[PDB]
Design a protein around this ligand. Sequence first.
Ligand SMILES: COc1c(CCc2ccc(NS(C)(=O)=O)cc2)cc(-c2ccc[nH]c2=O)cc1C(C)(C)C
Length: 557
Amino acid sequence: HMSYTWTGALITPCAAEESKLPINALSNSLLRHHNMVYATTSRSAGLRQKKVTFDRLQVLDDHYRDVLKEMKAKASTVKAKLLSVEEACKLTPPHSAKSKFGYGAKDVRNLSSKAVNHIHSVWKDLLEDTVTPIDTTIMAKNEVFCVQRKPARLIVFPDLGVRVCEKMALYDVVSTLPQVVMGSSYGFQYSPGQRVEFLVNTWKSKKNPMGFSYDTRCFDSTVTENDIRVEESIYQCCDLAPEARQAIKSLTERLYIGGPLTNSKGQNCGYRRCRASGVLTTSCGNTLTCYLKASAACRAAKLQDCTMLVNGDDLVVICESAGTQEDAASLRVFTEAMTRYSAPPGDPPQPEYDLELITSCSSNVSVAHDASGKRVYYLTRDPTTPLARAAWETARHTPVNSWLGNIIMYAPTLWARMILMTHFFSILLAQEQLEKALDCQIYGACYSIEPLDLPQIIERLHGLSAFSLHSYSPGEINRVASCLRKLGVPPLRVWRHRARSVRARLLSQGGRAATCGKYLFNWAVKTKLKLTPIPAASRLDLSGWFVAGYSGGDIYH
Ligand SMILES: COc1c(CCc2ccc(NS(C)(=O)=O)cc2)cc(-c2ccc[nH]c2=O)cc1C(C)(C)C
């Protein structure tokens, strides 16, 4: 029961790959320790292949089937619709990988006859054939990190034609099913502010709260054939059109369970028997499977009043404590149960008795004060990776602007406000690109966002307090300051100085730019302005935001 089988053919790049941080005239104003920053390339794919290749063994007990029966009962209340070819085409990202059948992502979006005729023939093939393994491309992701070097992560995706078909059959399913099955436990339905609110209310709902996060080692590769068939049986509980039932069965048998792996040069690299990281169902499948295995593991470990917070393979558990020594024992039993279910740990889980000390996927709850002096909880993270990616994006244009996604999601943080907003607004002013729409990712989905709309977006996700936070925690200030010394980033006093200039420059431009100056950089001036709700914020169509996760799902708006 190996996750993969390999032939020896290399995982090849699509274009020229850079690993060393590119340097331009702007680099040194952000980061001076250039040797600390790197991008992963196909050169390291061989090491990743070794790490993700292992035998999986599953032992399914009564807690597992009990949880599954409950999940299927909730899944049976879901009614899902088939999307038209047109609706599926419009969710396709403009720069999505082109089809091997002579058309690209822009042909799909333009509803070109060639693209639409091919999608219709793939659809007919899914309906008539439910056995033939569907070909997939295996690629090394190009992602930027700070040292202390990770090997490249792998992306496995079917052809553009198949991806449009996945949208037709499962887009409505993967968007509505998880919240119905998991209720308040489904993390992707929340904005960062709603997530903090959920975590605080849960922490306060326990007499003696205890919390931990569970890190599964190579989650996608731990996903078995059984897990993928179980996900299909959950999707089948929905009230679906008979063509949608057939397409879901076919995509499961032919694509989701496994298939051959092809490199960018057309060579066979091997065969997958685990979760594909670049399919529509990656996020939803990972969410349901993680929740199923964790919920059953919580019952097996006799964890009292367990509240899950699940986003794909990201798992947070908040429960009733039984003292430090018993909690240590319970987590070992939880881990043992997760292991039997083929979800073994990377780093073993540690019990926490302070909400701020629970870290999941580099993120944690922290505290600051609003304009009135009131204590306000917000989500932050270690800023090393966001700052390393910002340095790369200072010298190179990338398909996904991590700085923009980071300003949106981490707007209330000390580091996004003082550094990211200051730096990138300074660049956009000099380049006359304030009105240019830029792509970023929110919960794996791609969005086109104009930086001039940032104050309204921030107000809608975090409220006006994101523009007024002050008196950050000494733990948080210290992590930011330590990160700056490590990377060779100028100190916070330099950023405050530069921000007064960026603010004045934005105010001079008037209009939406002046609003950016007023709201985003009010923290920089000694005589603060009283910030009132922005009328444009209410007009913002933020539907489709915070519904579901679509990581690897090829989703645009
Ligand atoms: C953790 O929440 C997240 C997640 C969720 C991350 C996540 C995605 C997928 C999986 N797993 S998978 C691949 O199986 O679907 C797990 C976690 C993402 C972000 C975020 C930050 C900056 C830009 N864009 C963003 O979306 C922020 C949070 C906040 C809300 C903490 C700020």
